[PDB]
Design an enzyme around this catalytic site. Structure first.
Site, PDB file in Angstrom:
ATOM      1  N   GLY A   1       0.777  -1.221   0.000  1.00 49.05           N
ATOM      2  CA  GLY A   1       0.000   0.000   0.000  1.00 49.05           C
ATOM      3  C   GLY A   1       0.811   1.273   0.000  1.00 49.05           C
ATOM      4  O   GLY A   1       1.907   1.322  -0.554  1.00 49.05           O
TER       5      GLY A   1
ATOM      6  N   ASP B   1       9.195  -7.585  -9.182  1.00 42.34           N
ATOM      7  CA  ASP B   1       8.591  -8.360  -8.093  1.00 42.34           C
ATOM      8  C   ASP B   1       9.441  -9.594  -7.814  1.00 42.34           C
ATOM      9  O   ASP B   1       9.778 -10.346  -8.725  1.00 42.34           O
ATOM     10  CB  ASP B   1       7.162  -8.798  -8.454  1.00 42.34           C
ATOM     11  CG  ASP B   1       6.132  -7.660  -8.314  1.00 42.34           C
ATOM     12  OD1 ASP B   1       6.404  -6.712  -7.557  1.00 42.34           O
ATOM     13  OD2 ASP B   1       5.047  -7.734  -8.941  1.00 42.34           O
TER      14      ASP B   1
ATOM     15  N   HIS C   1       9.679  -5.590  -3.705  1.00 40.93           N
ATOM     16  CA  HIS C   1       9.763  -4.841  -4.950  1.00 40.93           C
ATOM     17  C   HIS C   1      10.259  -3.419  -4.748  1.00 40.93           C
ATOM     18  O   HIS C   1      10.767  -3.072  -3.682  1.00 40.93           O
ATOM     19  CB  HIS C   1       8.383  -4.808  -5.633  1.00 40.93           C
ATOM     20  CG  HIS C   1       7.385  -3.880  -4.993  1.00 40.93           C
ATOM     21  ND1 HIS C   1       6.079  -3.784  -5.430  1.00 40.93           N
ATOM     22  CD2 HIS C   1       7.509  -2.980  -3.985  1.00 40.93           C
ATOM     23  CE1 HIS C   1       5.446  -2.863  -4.723  1.00 40.93           C
ATOM     24  NE2 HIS C   1       6.291  -2.361  -3.841  1.00 40.93           N
TER      25      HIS C   1
ATOM     26  N   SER D   1       5.461  -6.523  -0.854  1.00 39.26           N
ATOM     27  CA  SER D   1       5.851  -5.130  -0.890  1.00 39.26           C
ATOM     28  C   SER D   1       5.966  -4.551   0.513  1.00 39.26           C
ATOM     29  O   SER D   1       6.789  -5.014   1.303  1.00 39.26           O
ATOM     30  CB  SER D   1       4.848  -4.355  -1.730  1.00 39.26           C
ATOM     31  OG  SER D   1       4.803  -4.911  -3.031  1.00 39.26           O
ATOM     32  N   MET D   2       5.157  -3.549   0.837  1.00 42.58           N
ATOM     33  CA  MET D   2       5.249  -2.944   2.166  1.00 42.58           C
ATOM     34  C   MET D   2       4.929  -3.979   3.239  1.00 42.58           C
ATOM     35  O   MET D   2       5.346  -3.839   4.392  1.00 42.58           O
ATOM     36  CB  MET D   2       4.321  -1.728   2.289  1.00 42.58           C
ATOM     37  CG  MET D   2       4.492  -0.942   3.586  1.00 42.58           C
ATOM     38  SD  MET D   2       6.210  -0.445   4.015  1.00 42.58           S
ATOM     39  CE  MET D   2       6.466   1.000   2.937  1.00 42.58           C
TER      40      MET D   2
END
Lengths: 173, 173, 173, 173, 173, 173, 173, 173, 173, 173, 173
Positions: free
Chosen positions: A51, A154, A105, A80-81
């Site tokens: 996000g 990714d 990523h 990700s986060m």
């Protein structure tokens, strides 16, 4: 409220997309616990696709601002986060169930307007890129050089591969 | 066809938004006017708030491609790329009616996606920004640094002011 | 084309809102008639509520640009820029049918963005307000002051009234 | 063209809603016909439900502006501005087919914004009402009061009744 | 209510876009803590991208209308009105976790209608820009000119740089 | 037709986005001119940002299918498939105006459904990528592995840089 | 019409998607070209992703309905119905440009409503599926079995492979 | 809730746009407080851009209907109807924070339909512009003439200025 | 809650369309009611037009899964899956009101995709059609053939006709 | 809460599509039950068409992460991830009512972007596919191959068939 | 809640459109009141324009399925299905206020699909039509033939007229 109740056992569930409203909630809880028993441990269960970059950071920094140990647990996925936050758990207290997917990523963004403004956002995100792709190293044992190469695109990993990568400590089997 | 008739007197009108379709039509008329007579001057009247950068450059570059002298005449307005084009007409032959307005500025655009891609788009639009300021300075007698400064934000000018700035040569009033 | 046989009689109709599209069709027709015969008068019938300011000045400027006198006839209505153009008719040759309505106003516009961007736009529209308020003053005989005061809000008037105001010369009744 | 063929016999059709576009076309034809022969009558058929006021006013004025008599024939229907135009036909030559329906009313419109502008628009619409009522009075033989009282709300009538009221001269049947 | 919980410890998070709804909630809380004890400190936590101008000022003017000291902590990000409010916290008690990102800029707005009204709105946005830029001067120690020069376009800085800039006193490093 | 006249001079214009419509128009034009005179060179002006791959490849294949040399001249831009086509013309006849920009990238696409269909698409888009990258390498003189790296992300170039890269032969300065 | 031009040499182009109208045009051109000369061959260029099954069959049949040999040339791509059609060209007269893409597959469709109605629609598409596989095998030399197994999911192949596979007769290179 | 809590202290938060649901809410809160202690003052905090007129008047009349003193306090802004209501607070008890902003104007509205109905609405709004300007004159010390003049177009002003003007009494600095 | 008091008496109301969430609710109410007393009968009032089939069988199985007799009572209507459920009530306790309407039919569904996937879904719905017809024939005493012929198209019944078909036992009238 | 009264007897319900939100709730309840008693068994009832992959895997892992035996009960349907989950219950304690339906298949997904991004996604979804195929073989006793062949397309099964395939242990009836 | 407070006095309110949702609350409330006291009286205040027929029948059969007398009082209006219910009230206790409107009509609906299906729906709606005509006839003491004649189109009545027509017993004036 099943979450209210679980929070009683010092457990926090971060589920889904990360943004201010949700990130605030996490923080609100983390603070709450620290203001209940600044001594104990905290169980942060993470199942997130990621996000808003700054939203997760608030969560990250708070995980350290407070006194209690923040143990992270990846159930489902940490992308990700979500992965970033996952590798920010208290060293040694970072876990993952066996079939969770961890993915890392580079930041995602947009810019619009005059050349001058696009340059400002570009530099601002590249800045956040560097800032995070150095914490990832300083959280995995990997170099910023290797962390720069894997996160270009990714980078999907299984729990077992993330432990061996440095994102986590133990894969609770 | 009123236009095809003025075209028969070497008159070419560039009005409204600029994009590939609009630019491909101006390019065609300019190549056509050349084959009809590579000696006689071309009169290009402009009333445009600009448009796509590369589309604009297709006109500018065609203007200098064909052997004919391309005279530019600003009616209504010539803003942004339209302003760029006006200033690109044959030396001594850049005109503007008395109540027309000229406006110069920096390029606009956007980028969305990975930090890496935003950066590539951001550089490319800064490269264009530099490219055109370079040409715009050479056409008006201004210093590159002076144009970079004056085009930072939208810069309006009257026919008279534009001539004093070097964007045009005379105000057929 | 009904408008084509009339263009032969040297009649040009300006009907509806003005925009670069519509305004170019006028300018082109005027340049054409100019190429056909530089001495004969041109009858510009105007039935419009107005529109884009630069498009307007585009027509006004062309009007004085060519050699033939451009007579203006107001049928139906001439509001805002449409009334502005009416007044710019060759002195002595400005007309209106008996029941046409004529209105004068101040420029309308829009601004969005950073404070410093809104200012540039705010100034540009004021310059055009001043610019056009004066040309009206000339055209009509009225003074800057009176013109400003009367155009602050829409000034609706009859043909007979526009005649007395100095926007037209005779009411072709 | 079927319509261009009838125009050949000096026949102009005015169907559907009235707006500048439509108006500007009837005017163009009226001007064309007068060109060819400014002596011969013209047949103006009307099957319209009304429309823009200043738009029909332009037609009405063009009908009396030219030399030829503008005969009006109501087919199907003539309401609001449609009726007003039908009554402005050449005295004695204002006809109607047996089963058409003539209808007359007061002006419709709208205003939005500050009270000052709303008052201005209200006064303007009121002037227009006044104008057209008395013009309706003068063409029908009715008093400004009978007409005003009778157009406060839509007033539908048949061809015969329309003649007894004095909007049309005869019912071609 | 996890939030109604921290409101006990005297904590309060300002998260997400600012607007009259949020502004009223923050001010309602402040007036609340001024009653529960008008001397003890308050913990206004900040994570906002900004919001409406006058809204932010509601929060600011309340942080000063009340007796208790309103400390401010930047978690995640404090951009625009958020950075502005972060800097309005009781001098000495303005913090930020190590990874927050601060950003200051100029007011954003929009205006439509008559040139008179654009100017009204343009002057007001400039005034608001004049006021806050001035307050950013008194808060950080920066000069009126410096601030204006740096807030022209988005000014991004880390917690450290912001403390360095005088926007905050300490980084809870 | 301005475009037709140019076609009578062996001039084909490829402007805007590429797709089966546009692609068919050019193929159709190239076949025709081959029939017109199988010896005379054909001049293919390109200002395109790319588009459907298979559409682009059908033009390229045709270019080599017909007898006459097909010279390409980049004006405005030649991005993606446009850069590809630009490089596919007769050797020693690949041109670009001074300010044209060239950009080479990898293919873009999409897939949805079961893992087997996605896998099938992926391989196919991966098959297309290799084909073109080897043809691009085969057009410029670069080693396949060199192109693969450069086109990984968007690669923008000036006309000059593109000649040195080997995409075009000369820059009509 | 440049297409009407090539049609003069018995060359037809089937580009883009197939449906009732693209099919009626193609069939008309086939019936017309037969009426033109029952002897001379016809060259059908195909660049299609496929389309409505029954539309493609109308062409498949007409090709074999008229006396002239209908040669098919794959440029760009021949996908699905497009590939089916390509394979139905006159024996020995089926070709492809070197870089064309060829893809064969099973029918796509949908049904909605009562269980009975779905079953009916389902039996129907399994019939078209069976019919087209049989013809494919017949035209390629493959067996119905192999065609079935292979078109189960999208089967992508190059021109050189479509030849080996037997869908085409020769790759024009 | 937070608000209700402040209610028992006699604070009523008028926040956001104004309409019948919000007004009845304010009204209801005032009555209650009245029905409570008809002697102790009420602190009506206003921070809104205004809203529906008959709606605002209902907060006003009620404010005078009850016996308690309704003190007004502008926080953030009191614009249009908000500024009205602010100035309507009990004599000598109209406050405002230092950076709040006050703006007074003339009513806005609209009408649609027949001229007879547009007039009724036009006269009705001129009426309210009249009503409120008189009350606006009293409350401040200004004269009707000085209010009609300044309110013509939006008239913004600082807290000090608002005091000077006579709209509020003290500026709690 | 009104529904919660009627639940106390073991009354379960099923109204509206049937989907997963509506079904789960009934299941949860049947289960709950089983714990309270595995003996006492249950009343399941039905007023439904049907809905998702698997959702329906969800209630059906639970109805026979728990210990207590679940009597059904048709009020308003029991159509499709609603009527299916009505007949699955304990034999002898399948009641309906004097004016309820019962309608039985075959399943409704949809499918899209390749011919292969359509078939699978087609067979799955047909398997449900037979499975359910067999259960209806078994619930009512009717034979498979007769149930098939009757549900081919929607079959409407009165409470009286229903009971005489075997769908319900008695008509509480 | 009828669902919270069921959680009391240790009964969790999973109805409808599976996504992070729905999964987060299931997990929470599982964690809470292991808290309320780590020995008593838990009954997870499933009526689901499936959903997000990782979401389901997070429930499967939580199921095997805690101590209580979590048996599964299929009502209505368990398809895709629903079936996958059903078969993950405590060996010997996987159940289904007689009429629910079980369906297994391969993962579904999407990819947009560059070939590089497409490939990374395709590999990932094929990865979780191989993963899930392995986990389904282990839970059913089937071979990794039988599962691969069987799930290539939606494989619908009755409860009896499912139990015979080794997906559920028993069919309550 | 307030509608519940009234339910304590055996007062049930039926306001607005009628549908399963609406009819379910009414049906629930009726069954409950009887569980409260099967002897007393229920007052069904009806202000409805009607709705779903089977929905109405649902409330109709319950009124008479329970033991207590269902007294229906009309307020506002009882139109379409609404009037049927009012009239279905306990013989002798059907009321209405003085200014309520009562309206009776024939059923409304629609159908789409195969002729065979439209016919099935057509006959079903005719069945529901004759069914309510006979019951409406009974409730009022009129002729089936008379009721049919008056409901062929909407039949509005005042309370006075409903009393004389036989729909209500008394009019509480």
């Amino acid at each position: 409220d099943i979450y209210s109740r679980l929070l009683k056992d010092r457990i926090v569930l971060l589920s889904g997309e990360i943004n201010d409203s949700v990130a605030s909630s996490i923080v609100a809880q983390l603070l709450f616990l620290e203001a209940e028993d600044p001594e104990k441990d905290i169980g942060l269960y993470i199942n997130s696709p990621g996000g808003v970059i700054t939203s997760g950071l608030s969560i990250y920094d708070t995980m350290n601002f407070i006194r209690p140990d923040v143990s992270t647990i990846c159930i489902g996925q940490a992308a990700s986060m979500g992965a970033f936050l996952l590798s920010c758990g208290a060293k040694g207290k970072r876990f993952s169930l066996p079939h969770s997917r961890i993915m890392i990523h580079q930041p995602l963004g947009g810019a619009q307007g005059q050349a001058s403004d696009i340059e400002i956002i570009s530099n601002e995100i590249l800045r956040l890129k560097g800032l995070m792709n150095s914490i990832l190293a300083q959280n995995s044992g990997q170099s910023l050089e290797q962390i720069a190469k894997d996160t270009d695109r990714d980078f999907y990993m299984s729990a077992k591969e993330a432990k061996e990568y440095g994102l986590i400590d133990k894969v609770l089997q």
